[PDB]
PDB file of N, CA, C and O in Angstrom:
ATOM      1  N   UNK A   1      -0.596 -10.530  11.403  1.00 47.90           N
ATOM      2  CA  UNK A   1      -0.794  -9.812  10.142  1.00 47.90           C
ATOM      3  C   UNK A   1       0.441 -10.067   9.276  1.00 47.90           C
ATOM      4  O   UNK A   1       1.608 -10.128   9.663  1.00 47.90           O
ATOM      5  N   UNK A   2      -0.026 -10.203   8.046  1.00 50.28           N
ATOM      6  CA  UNK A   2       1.408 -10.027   7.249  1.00 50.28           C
ATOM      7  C   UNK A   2       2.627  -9.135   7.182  1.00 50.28           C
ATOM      8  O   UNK A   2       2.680  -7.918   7.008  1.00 50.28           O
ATOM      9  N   UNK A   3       3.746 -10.159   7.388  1.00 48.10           N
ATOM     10  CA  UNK A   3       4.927  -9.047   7.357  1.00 48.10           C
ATOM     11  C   UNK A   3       4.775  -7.720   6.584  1.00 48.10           C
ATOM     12  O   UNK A   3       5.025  -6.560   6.910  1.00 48.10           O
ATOM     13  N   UNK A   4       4.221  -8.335   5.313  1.00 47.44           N
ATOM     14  CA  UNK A   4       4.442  -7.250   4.214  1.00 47.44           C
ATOM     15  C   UNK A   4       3.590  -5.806   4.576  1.00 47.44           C
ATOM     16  O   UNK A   4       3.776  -4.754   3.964  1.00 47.44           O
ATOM     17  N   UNK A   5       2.850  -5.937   5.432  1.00 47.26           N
ATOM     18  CA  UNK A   5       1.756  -4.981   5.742  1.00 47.26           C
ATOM     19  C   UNK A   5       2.189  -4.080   6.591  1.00 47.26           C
ATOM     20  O   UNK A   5       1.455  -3.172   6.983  1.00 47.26           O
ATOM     21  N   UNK A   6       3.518  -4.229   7.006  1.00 45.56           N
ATOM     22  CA  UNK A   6       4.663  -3.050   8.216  1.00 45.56           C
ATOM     23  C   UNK A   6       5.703  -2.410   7.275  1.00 45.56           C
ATOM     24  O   UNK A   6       6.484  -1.679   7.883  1.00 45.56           O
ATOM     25  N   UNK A   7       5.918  -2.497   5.916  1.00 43.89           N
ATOM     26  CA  UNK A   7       6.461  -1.872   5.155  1.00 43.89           C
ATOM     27  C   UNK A   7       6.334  -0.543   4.883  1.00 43.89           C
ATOM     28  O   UNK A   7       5.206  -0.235   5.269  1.00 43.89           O
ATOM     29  N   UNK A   8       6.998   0.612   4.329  1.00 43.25           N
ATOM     30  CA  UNK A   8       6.455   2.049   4.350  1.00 43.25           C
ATOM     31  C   UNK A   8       5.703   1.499   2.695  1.00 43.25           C
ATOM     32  O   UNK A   8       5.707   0.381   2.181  1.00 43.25           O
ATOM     33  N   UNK A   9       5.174   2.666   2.257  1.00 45.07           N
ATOM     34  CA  UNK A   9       4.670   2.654   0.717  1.00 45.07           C
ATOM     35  C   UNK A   9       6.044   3.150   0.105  1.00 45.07           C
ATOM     36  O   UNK A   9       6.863   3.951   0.556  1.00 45.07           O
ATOM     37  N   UNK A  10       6.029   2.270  -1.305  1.00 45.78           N
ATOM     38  CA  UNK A  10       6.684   2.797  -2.434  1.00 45.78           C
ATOM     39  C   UNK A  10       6.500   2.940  -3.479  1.00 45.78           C
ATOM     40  O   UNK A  10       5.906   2.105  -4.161  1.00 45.78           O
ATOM     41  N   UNK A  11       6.933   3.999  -3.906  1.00 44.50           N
ATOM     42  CA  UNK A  11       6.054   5.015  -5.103  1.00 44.50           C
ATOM     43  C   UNK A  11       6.703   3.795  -6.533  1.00 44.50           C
ATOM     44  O   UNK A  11       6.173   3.257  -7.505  1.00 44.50           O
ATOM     45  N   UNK A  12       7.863   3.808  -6.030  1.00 44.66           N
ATOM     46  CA  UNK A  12       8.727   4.136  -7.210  1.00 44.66           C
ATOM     47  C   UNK A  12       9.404   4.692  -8.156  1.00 44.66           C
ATOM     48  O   UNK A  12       9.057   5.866  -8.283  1.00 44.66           O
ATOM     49  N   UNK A  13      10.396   4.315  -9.040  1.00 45.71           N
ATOM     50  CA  UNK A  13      10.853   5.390  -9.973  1.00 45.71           C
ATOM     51  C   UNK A  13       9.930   6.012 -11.535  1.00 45.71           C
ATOM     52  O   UNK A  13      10.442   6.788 -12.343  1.00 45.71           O
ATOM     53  N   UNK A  14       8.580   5.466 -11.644  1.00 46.89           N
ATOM     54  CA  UNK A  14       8.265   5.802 -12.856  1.00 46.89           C
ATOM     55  C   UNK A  14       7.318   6.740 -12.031  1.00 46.89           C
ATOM     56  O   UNK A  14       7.004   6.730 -10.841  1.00 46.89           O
ATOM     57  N   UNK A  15       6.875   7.786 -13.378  1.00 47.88           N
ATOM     58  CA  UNK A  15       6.331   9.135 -13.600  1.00 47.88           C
ATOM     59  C   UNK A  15       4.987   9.273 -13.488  1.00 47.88           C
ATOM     60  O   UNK A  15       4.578  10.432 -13.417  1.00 47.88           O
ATOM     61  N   UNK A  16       3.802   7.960 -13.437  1.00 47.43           N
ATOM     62  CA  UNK A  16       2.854   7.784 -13.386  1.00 47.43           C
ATOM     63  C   UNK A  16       2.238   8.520 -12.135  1.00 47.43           C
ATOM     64  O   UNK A  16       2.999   9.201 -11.448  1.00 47.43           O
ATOM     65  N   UNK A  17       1.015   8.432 -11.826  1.00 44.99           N
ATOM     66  CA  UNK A  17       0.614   9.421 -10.858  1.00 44.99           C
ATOM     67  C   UNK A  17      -0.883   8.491 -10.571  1.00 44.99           C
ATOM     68  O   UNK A  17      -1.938   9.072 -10.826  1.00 44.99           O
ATOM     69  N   UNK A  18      -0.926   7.394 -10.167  1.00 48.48           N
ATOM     70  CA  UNK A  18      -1.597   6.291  -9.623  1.00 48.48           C
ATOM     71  C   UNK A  18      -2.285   6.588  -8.062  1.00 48.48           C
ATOM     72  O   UNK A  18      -1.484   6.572  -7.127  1.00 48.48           O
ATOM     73  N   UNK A  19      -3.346   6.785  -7.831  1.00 44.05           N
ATOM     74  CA  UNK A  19      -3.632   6.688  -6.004  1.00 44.05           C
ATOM     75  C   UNK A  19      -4.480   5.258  -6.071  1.00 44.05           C
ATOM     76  O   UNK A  19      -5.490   4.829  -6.629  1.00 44.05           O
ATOM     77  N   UNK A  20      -3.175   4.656  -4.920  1.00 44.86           N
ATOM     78  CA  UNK A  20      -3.083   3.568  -4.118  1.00 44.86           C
ATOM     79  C   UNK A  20      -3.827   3.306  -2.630  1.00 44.86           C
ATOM     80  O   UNK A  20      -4.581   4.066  -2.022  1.00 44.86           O
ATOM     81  N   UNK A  21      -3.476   2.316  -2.355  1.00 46.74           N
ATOM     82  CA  UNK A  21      -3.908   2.231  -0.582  1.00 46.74           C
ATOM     83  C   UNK A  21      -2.806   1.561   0.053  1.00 46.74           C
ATOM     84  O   UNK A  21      -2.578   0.437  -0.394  1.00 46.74           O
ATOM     85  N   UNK A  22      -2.106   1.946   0.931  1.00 47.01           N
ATOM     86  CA  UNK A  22      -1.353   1.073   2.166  1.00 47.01           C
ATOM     87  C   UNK A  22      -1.886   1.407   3.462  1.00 47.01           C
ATOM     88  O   UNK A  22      -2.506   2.376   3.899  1.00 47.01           O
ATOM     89  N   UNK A  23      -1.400   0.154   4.028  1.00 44.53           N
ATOM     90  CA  UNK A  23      -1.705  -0.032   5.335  1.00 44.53           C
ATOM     91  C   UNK A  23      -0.594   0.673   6.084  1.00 44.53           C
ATOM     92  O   UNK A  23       0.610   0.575   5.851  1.00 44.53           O
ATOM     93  N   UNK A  24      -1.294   1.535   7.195  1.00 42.75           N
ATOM     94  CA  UNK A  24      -0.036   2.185   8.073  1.00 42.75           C
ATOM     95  C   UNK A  24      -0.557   1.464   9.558  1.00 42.75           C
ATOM     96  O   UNK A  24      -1.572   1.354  10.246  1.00 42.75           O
ATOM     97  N   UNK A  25       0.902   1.054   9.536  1.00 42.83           N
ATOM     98  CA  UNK A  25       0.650  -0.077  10.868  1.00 42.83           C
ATOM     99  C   UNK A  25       0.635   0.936  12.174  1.00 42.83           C
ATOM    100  O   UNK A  25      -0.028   0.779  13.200  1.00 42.83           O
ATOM    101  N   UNK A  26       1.432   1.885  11.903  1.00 42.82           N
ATOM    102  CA  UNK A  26       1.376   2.733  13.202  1.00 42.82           C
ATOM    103  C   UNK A  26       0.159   3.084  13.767  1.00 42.82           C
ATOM    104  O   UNK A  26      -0.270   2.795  14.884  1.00 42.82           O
ATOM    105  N   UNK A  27      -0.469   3.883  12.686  1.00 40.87           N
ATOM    106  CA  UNK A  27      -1.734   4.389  12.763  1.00 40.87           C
ATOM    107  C   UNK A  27      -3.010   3.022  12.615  1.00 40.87           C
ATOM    108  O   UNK A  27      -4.173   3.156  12.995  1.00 40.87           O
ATOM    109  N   UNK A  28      -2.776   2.500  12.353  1.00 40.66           N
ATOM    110  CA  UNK A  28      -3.993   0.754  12.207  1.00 40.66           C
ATOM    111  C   UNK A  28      -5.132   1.522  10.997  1.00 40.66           C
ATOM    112  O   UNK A  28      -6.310   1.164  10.971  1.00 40.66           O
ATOM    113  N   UNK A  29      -4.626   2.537  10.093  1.00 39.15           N
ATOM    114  CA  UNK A  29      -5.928   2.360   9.368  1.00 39.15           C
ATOM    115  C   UNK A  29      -4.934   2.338   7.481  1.00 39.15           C
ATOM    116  O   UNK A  29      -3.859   2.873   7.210  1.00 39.15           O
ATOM    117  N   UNK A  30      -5.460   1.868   6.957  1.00 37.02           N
ATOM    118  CA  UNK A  30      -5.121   2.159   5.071  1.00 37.02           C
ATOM    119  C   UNK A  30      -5.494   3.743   4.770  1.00 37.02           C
ATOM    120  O   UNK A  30      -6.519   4.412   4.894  1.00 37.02           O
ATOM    121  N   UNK A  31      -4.226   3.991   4.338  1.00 37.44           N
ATOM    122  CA  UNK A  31      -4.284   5.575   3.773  1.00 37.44           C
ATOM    123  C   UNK A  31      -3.913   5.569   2.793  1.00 37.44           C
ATOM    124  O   UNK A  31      -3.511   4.469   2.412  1.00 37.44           O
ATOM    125  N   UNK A  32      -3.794   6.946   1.625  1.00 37.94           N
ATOM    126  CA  UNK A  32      -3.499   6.462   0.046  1.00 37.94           C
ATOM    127  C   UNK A  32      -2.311   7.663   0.173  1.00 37.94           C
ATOM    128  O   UNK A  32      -1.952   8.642   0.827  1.00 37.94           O
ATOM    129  N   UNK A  33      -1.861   6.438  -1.461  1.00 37.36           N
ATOM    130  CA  UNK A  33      -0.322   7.320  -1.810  1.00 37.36           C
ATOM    131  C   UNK A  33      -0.619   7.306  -2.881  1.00 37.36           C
ATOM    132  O   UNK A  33      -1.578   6.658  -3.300  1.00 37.36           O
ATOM    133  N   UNK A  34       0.083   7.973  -3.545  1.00 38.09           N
ATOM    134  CA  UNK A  34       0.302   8.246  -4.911  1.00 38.09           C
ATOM    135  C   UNK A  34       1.919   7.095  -5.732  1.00 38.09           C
ATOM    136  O   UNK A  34       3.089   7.470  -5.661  1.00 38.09           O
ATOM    137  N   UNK A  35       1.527   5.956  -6.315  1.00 38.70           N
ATOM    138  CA  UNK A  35       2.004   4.825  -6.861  1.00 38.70           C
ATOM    139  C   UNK A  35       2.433   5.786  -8.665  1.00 38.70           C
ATOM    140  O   UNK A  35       1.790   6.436  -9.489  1.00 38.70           O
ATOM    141  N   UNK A  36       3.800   5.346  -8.503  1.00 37.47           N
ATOM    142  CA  UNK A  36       4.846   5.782  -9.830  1.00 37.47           C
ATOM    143  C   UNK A  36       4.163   4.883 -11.407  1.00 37.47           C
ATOM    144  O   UNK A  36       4.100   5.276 -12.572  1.00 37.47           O
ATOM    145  N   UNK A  37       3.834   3.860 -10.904  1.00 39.78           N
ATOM    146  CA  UNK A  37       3.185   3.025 -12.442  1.00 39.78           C
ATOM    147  C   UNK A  37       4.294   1.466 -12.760  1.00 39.78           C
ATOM    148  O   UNK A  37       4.104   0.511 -13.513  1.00 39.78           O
ATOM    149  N   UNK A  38       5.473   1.791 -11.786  1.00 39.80           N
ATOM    150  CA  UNK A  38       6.071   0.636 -12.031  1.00 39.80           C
ATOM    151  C   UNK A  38       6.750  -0.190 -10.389  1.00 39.80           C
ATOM    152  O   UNK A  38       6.582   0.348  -9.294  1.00 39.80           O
ATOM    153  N   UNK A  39       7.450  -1.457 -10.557  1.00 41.17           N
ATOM    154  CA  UNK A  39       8.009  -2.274  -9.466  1.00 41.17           C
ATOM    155  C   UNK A  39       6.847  -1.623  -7.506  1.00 41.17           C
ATOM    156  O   UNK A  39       7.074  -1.056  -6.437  1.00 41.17           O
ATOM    157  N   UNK A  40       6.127  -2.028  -7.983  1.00 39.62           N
ATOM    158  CA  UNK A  40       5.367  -2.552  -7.039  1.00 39.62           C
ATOM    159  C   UNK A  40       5.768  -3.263  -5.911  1.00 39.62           C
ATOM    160  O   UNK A  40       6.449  -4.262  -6.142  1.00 39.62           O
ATOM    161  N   UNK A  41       5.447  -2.929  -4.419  1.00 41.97           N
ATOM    162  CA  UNK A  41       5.899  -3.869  -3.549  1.00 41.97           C
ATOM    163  C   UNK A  41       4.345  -4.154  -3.253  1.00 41.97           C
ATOM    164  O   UNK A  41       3.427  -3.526  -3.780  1.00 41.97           O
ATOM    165  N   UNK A  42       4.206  -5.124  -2.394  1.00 41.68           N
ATOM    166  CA  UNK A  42       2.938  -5.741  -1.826  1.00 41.68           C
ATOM    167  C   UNK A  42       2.054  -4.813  -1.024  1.00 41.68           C
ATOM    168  O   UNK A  42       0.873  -4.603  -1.298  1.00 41.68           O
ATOM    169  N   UNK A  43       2.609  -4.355  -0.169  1.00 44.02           N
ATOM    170  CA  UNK A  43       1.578  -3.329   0.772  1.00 44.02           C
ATOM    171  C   UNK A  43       1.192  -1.625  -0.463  1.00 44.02           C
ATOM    172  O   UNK A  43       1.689  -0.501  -0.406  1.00 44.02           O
ATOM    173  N   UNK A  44       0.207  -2.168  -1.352  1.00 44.09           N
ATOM    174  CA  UNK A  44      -0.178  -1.580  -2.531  1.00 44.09           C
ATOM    175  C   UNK A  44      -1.266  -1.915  -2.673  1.00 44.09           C
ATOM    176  O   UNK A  44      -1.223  -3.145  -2.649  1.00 44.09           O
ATOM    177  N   UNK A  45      -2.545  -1.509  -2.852  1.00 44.59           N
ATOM    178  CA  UNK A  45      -3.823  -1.692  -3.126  1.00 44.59           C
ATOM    179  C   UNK A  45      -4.432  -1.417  -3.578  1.00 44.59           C
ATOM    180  O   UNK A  45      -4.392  -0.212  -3.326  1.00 44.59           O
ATOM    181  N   UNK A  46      -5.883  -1.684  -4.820  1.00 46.20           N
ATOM    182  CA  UNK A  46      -6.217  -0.692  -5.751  1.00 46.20           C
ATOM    183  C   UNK A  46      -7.718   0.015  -4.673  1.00 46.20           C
ATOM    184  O   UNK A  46      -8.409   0.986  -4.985  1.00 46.20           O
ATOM    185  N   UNK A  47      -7.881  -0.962  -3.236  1.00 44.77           N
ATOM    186  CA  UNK A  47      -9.078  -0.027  -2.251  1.00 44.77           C
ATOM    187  C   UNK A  47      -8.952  -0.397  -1.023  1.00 44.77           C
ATOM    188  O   UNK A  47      -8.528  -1.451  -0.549  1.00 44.77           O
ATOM    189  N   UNK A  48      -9.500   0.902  -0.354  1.00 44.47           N
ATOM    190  CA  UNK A  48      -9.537   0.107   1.194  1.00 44.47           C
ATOM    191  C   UNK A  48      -9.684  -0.879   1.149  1.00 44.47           C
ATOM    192  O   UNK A  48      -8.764  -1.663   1.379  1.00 44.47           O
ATOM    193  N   UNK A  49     -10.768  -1.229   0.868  1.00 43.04           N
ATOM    194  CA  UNK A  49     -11.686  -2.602   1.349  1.00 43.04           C
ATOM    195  C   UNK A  49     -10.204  -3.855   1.227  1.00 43.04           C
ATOM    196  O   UNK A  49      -9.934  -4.627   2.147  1.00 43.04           O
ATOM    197  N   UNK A  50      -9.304  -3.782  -0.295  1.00 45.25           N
ATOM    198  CA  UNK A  50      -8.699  -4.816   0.118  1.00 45.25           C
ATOM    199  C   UNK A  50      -7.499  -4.625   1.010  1.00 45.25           C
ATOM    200  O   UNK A  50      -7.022  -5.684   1.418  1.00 45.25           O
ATOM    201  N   UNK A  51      -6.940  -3.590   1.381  1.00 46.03           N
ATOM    202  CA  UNK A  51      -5.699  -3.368   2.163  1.00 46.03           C
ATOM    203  C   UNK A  51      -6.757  -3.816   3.296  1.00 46.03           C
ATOM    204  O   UNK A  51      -6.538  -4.936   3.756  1.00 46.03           O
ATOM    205  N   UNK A  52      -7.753  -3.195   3.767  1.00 47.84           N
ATOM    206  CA  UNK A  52      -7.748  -3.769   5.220  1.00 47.84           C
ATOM    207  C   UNK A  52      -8.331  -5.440   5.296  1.00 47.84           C
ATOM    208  O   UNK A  52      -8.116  -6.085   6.323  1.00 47.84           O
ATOM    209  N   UNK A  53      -8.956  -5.965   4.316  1.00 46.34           N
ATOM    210  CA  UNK A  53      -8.692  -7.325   4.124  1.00 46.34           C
ATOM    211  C   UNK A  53      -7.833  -8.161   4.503  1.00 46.34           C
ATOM    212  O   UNK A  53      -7.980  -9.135   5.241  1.00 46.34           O
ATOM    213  N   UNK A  54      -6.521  -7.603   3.762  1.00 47.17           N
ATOM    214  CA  UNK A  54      -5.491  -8.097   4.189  1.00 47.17           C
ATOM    215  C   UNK A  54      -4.464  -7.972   4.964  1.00 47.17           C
ATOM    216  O   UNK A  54      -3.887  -8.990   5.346  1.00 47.17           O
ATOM    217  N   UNK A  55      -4.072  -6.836   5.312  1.00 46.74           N
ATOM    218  CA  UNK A  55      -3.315  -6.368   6.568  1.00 46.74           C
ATOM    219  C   UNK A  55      -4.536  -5.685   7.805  1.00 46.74           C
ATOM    220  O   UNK A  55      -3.960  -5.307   8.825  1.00 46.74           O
ATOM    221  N   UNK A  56      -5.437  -5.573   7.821  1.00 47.18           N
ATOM    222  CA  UNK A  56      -6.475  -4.626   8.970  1.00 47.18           C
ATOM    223  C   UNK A  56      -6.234  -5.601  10.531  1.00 47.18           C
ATOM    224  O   UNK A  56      -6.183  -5.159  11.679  1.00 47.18           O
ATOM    225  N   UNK A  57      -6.081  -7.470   9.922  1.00 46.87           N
ATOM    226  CA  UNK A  57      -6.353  -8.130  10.958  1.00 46.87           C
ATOM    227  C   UNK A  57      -5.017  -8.481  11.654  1.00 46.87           C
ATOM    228  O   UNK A  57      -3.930  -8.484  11.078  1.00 46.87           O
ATOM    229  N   UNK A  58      -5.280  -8.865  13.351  1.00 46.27           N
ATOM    230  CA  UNK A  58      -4.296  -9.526  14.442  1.00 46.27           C
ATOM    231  C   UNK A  58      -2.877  -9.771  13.613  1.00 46.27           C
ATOM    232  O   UNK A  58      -1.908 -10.273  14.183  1.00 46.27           O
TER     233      UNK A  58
END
């Protein structure tokens, strides 16, 4: 699986109030956070369907 997909979520510093999807590797399923509106890291998703797309597998 992609490195990027063992990262925690980050909100960020802006004020926006966005619900996201990351992958929680601990747990093996995509759960949502609440995304600030700015600097984005990768393990960020606008739905399940694509977080577990891309981080769900081996």
């Amino acid at each position: 699986r992609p490195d990027f997909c063992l990262e925690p979520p980050y909100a960020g510093a802006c004020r926006a109030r966005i619900i996201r999807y990351f992958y929680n590797a601990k747990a093996g399923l995509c759960q949502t956070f609440v995304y600030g509106g700015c600097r984005a890291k990768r393990n960020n998703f606008k739905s399940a369907e694509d977080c577990l797309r891309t981080c769900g597998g081996a």
